């Protein structure tokens, strides 16, 4: 690939205008020059099946520019032009009916359909598919075009000429899926009511509402994925009824069949919390959904989360104590190596199990490794289910805690390999394990409103501002650490040995940036004067300016989300509820909501909501 | 208890709708199906005393859905249905008159009262009591229902059929108490004027205004507890009169009898500052109240607070100097224990009183312990008065300073036990006493506007943000302190002994989090390389990110209250005024306001307010 899409798309859009300029019939379609077009079509003339650079006809050009005078004269001379689709790459299958509807030209649609335009024509070209570089997605059928332009009269005219409402495009979207993807949401529900009124369940196999996608999503399920909360509240108007109303009080009964999704392998609520669209989190604060996941969290979600929190915390204490007590003996080698002298005075034991206090630790260590395969048997089946990047990427479904808890379980499994192999470097995977193990306890901080939004800010600082600061911090601690190394390369390393080696001078200048270590000073020796100029420059540019600017932007990444993670914590417990309702067994978590079978109203499981309004 | 309330309340609300669906008479009451209901009640038919699942009648169902056609046909066939209450747990005592008023159905109330509905019926069920899970509290009588719906015409119709306005519900609330608990406050005072106009003091024992609650509160006293400032200003319109008005100036004379509450054991002003409701602090900025507690604070509150401040500060100097000089002698045991060698070189004296300089300290120490029982004789009678959790919980009445000053007086009493027992660990209760003693001086920082709101922010940071940060700080200093301990478990503890023990490694990593101690470094020895990776990870995640995010949210808990504790300090001196007017004697604090007895207008003590208005 040498060129890209839009450079090809601009080439088609200018080759198309050239052929309109080159051919006098196509120009007379564009100019609405019915003077010339009468004289031109009076005689035997240009073939009406002459094409542009895209496969357009003269009727497509006469409809792209709303010229119903020229389009009448074209169809009177050539009636077979109404059934003609374009033929080349971007506009494949687009008919003049696809354009007369998209211009909302009603009198052109009547003139086209009287000439036998096909309402079942589907624009299968790549300039109609739902792609991030197409500006609109209106579907493929002209009935689907009339809905997304919001024209009530073309829809009432296209059904009368035999457009089935269950017409499914190449994505699997029927027209009810496509109305949900439109941006002017409060004008789309009136087309949604109009399209369902013409449905009238003659087919009634899924009754146009349960007709899924190629990704399985019904239109109700898709409104939660795309975050169409205006369409969601409209869709719940037919899934409820008011039991009674007494003054200010009102008790209404929501259907909860398509929200709870009991038998479904991929429920409605996982598709809302694992949706990458960002207005999908406003679905979780709607009138049947908010009451449902609050009932699941309080009655069963937070009690079952706190025991798992109190078990994992008690698990990590058992892992920590098997690190604190760990098999160490005095080293075999007398230290003949006093070179920055070796402070390592003891080494690992090999197969140390002699004492009874060790046998208590053997019990303890087996809780760690069998606790770790339990961790592995819970998560690596779930990376194979959502796609291993939808899993790790979405930061409300655990996200960068499943990466941590898998890495933790990998390292303690790696440690028990080394304990049986008698490898010597056991301290390296254990130190990574203890950090990753105990910082994974912050996963359970989502279960508490105090601690909840506070832990999302740490994820928006590790990934947000640390990747916007550590690059422009590493250039300062590479220029200055080298500058501090060169100034001290010619000195005694026993007096101010903070820059004696270049690896340690990177470490000291990393610390002096953060001022977690003291400024280097030895007042009983003459330091080089270039150091006092370099360090005074360093302390201003790095310590003073660059920290307190990073704190200034980290203070702004907190202020920008301190009013926005109180709403993401309310979406973080929903992703914890439906994670827990799916994993741990069925005799815990019974079906939420009132069973509508002991009362004579069905088998659907309802949710009753009592509300007050003045 | 297996299920909870609302799961029982939802069960009643759906069992009730089932019986309406099961019985054709109850359905015809709901449907307004007067076709069927005429045919049904033409014959001998279902018993009219058939009930739903709650004890409802057909007349209750015909009034829950405002069907006065069906309710007329029900009462014409069965006239004894108007006097029928429901019989089961949530709706006990609710009559159809309780529903016809709550729907504000005036023509249904006239048709019910003509059939002999009882206006004195009281809905004693649990779905009418003032509880946090009921959405409204409208009282129990239908006159009380007509007031809280704001229907002037039902009240003017229910009095005419003999509803006494002094009708007291199970909480002790008369209807004037219930109008104050309503949320649309500016529409409730017009019902308050209407209800007082029909009172006309024929009873005149308390004249409906002094009729207390079961918690003793009159409606004027309850408007300060619930913070009904709209009702409070309306209640002070009848407790004032303008002496004169001259252009812009106006001198008005407030009654101050029910505000100052002179003979009352529980005054009006303690019920406003110790109220847990949060709009009760706007009562303290109203036109007779703000001028009264400003006069009490300036004339007598701040002079008497500053001597008690200057006495307690001078008391704490006397306690501190008896700690600084304290009986210590050189230790008896030669230190045969050089294990992290014992720096303890001297011990406690036993009965040390030999010298004259000690006898000065004996005078000093008795000021401390008799100052401490004086503290105990002032506070532990007051935990037995407000309820020992209303006392400690409310942070404007001292709050977490009465916990401190009781703990301080407990520890110096515990110290004088140890001085007579010759216990050895006297340093432990004294160190707690000196911290708690001198930080209790911040109680007196409420007496000064500069220092006032600054000390409320420390209480909103100790309890607010420290409990939202120290949990997610303790997981970092447990993962890293263990990770720093394991990496240094196999080294010489004499070179970088900051993580030699696991208790001290928790201490060092606690300090390195805050960077109150230097980063561990010893450039004359080879530190383990895993430390330089762990510490560089620690300094970024803990020192840099997690501090300056905690400062970012602690900066936001200050910015959110720097415009809100300037109004809580103005409620913190009111709680200090009425604390001081109650405790210290009566010859200090004379009665505030002008005695209306030397002038010929009563014996009530008035407050004169001169104000300016353009």
UniProtKB/Swiss-Prot annotation, chains A, B:
What parts of the sequence cross the membrane?
304-324, 362-384, 396-418, 425-445, 469-489, 533-553
Positions annotated as glycosylated: 334
Please list the GO terms describing molecular function.
calcium channel activity; calmodulin binding; identical protein binding; metal ion binding
Q: How is it modified after translation?
A: Glycosylated.
Q: Please give the tissue specificity annotation from the record for this chain.
A: Detected in kidney cortex, in distal convoluted tubules and cortical collecting ducts (at protein level). Detected in duodenum, jejunum, ileum, kidney and placenta.
GO CC aspect terms: apical plasma membrane; plasma membrane
Q: How is its activity regulated?
A: Activated by WNK3.
Question: What's the protein name?
Answer: Transient receptor potential cation channel subfamily V member 5
Q: Please name the source species.
A: Oryctolagus cuniculus
* Phylogenetic classification of the source organism: Eukaryota, Metazoa, Chordata, Craniata, Vertebrata
Please state which portion of the whole protein this structure contains, as first and last residue out of the total length.
25 to 638 of 730
